[PDB]
């Protein structure tokens, strides 16, 4: 029956409604202290593509 959208990556990723899957930056959690603002403002967003074609698929049915 109807394939199930993967609730997970659905609950945690973006793709601009043109087809370019663009995600969210990590390595940002339990660090911060000896680090600097450079890593801060950089640790504000992310990118990606190529295998996020397979991920663009994994989204599935409602596309999104």
């Amino acid at each position: 029956p109807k394939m199930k959208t993967h609730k997970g990556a659905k609950k945690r990723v973006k793709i601009t409604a043109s087809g370019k899957v663009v995600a969210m930056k990590t390595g940002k959690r339990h660090l911060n202290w000896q680090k600097s603002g450079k890593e801060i403002r950089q640790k504000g967003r992310k990118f990606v593509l190529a295998k996020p074609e397979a991920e663009r698929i994994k989204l599935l049915l409602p596309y999104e």
Partner: protein, 97 residues
């Protein structure tokens, strides 16, 4: 080996607690190039079973398009779209008086 590049991190602010989703007044973004396509009047009943709309609550006139001496009917009006009413049009909010 690793998780499916699951190294990504979730944010999904309010991914729904459990009692359900917020029963909220959803919308309908629209353009005045669509208002330009038809003259006369753009009420709900017309635009719903024609145009776009589809049984979906508040309409918001906006975007670029053309200014014409016609009547619209919606619920919220963008400041930009409010200015295409200036050149020619009508401004009807929330119906009931």
């Amino acid at each position: 080996g690793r998780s499916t590049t699951l190294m990504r991190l979730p944010k999904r602010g309010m991914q729904g607690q459990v009692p359900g989703e917020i029963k909220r007044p959803r919308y309908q973004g629209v353009n005045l190039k669509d208002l330009a396509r038809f003259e006369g009047e753009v009420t709900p009943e017309l635009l719903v079973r024609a145009g776009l709309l589809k049984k979906g609550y508040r309409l918001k006139i906006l975007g670029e398009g053309e200014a014409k001496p016609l009547k619209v009917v919606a619920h919220a009006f963008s400041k930009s779209a409010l200015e295409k009413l200036k050149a020619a049009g009508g401004e009807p909010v929330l119906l009931e008086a």
